Amino acid sequence: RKQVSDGVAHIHASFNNTIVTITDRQGNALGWATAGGSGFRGSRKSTPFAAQVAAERCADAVKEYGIKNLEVMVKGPGPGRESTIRALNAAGFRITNITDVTPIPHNGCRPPKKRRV
């Protein structure tokens, strides 16, 4: 029912996971997939191969809308951050825009200590 030829390909390059979500141009979600559906655990979640697995699942769930332009929103570290880009393109999308919205500390929150070992 949406169909506008363009949409942001949002990618959340999590350092612990990788989510891939294709949103509308107007920020209205259309599809998503992740490492957990790919069938991974651990830090294996976060690899180039695994990112393909999700980037491509997601493609079957958004292609029938007719989207084929990208506005890449690389967000966070997390390997496999460009597997996804390349994957999309290499599957009936086209690149247009590489954009950054990424949270940047100004230390508006206080970071935890995490694992100190």
């Binding site: 890449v72 690389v74 966070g76 570290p77 460009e82 880009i85 390349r86 393109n89 290499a90 086209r94 690149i95 247009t96 825009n97 590489i98 954009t99 950054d100 990424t102 940047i104 500390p105 230390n107 206080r110 970071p111 935890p112 200590k113 995490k114």
Partner: protein
């Protein structure tokens, strides 16, 4: 960054664009901040440069 390719390719590289962000900017903030610690280590690099 919001730098972008000018013609549509995967030849054009986006790990260029990790020039200004994630460059002391991320991938080391997830730890608590102490005023002593980043101040101290800087003084290691100027014995380096002169020597």
């Amino acid at each position: 960054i919001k730098v972008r390719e000018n013609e549509p390719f995967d030849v054009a590289l986006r790990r260029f664009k990790r020039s200004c962000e994630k460059a002391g900017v991320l991938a080391e903030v997830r730890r608590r901040e102490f005023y002593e610690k980043p101040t101290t280590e800087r003084k290691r690099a100027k014995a380096s440069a002169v020597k």
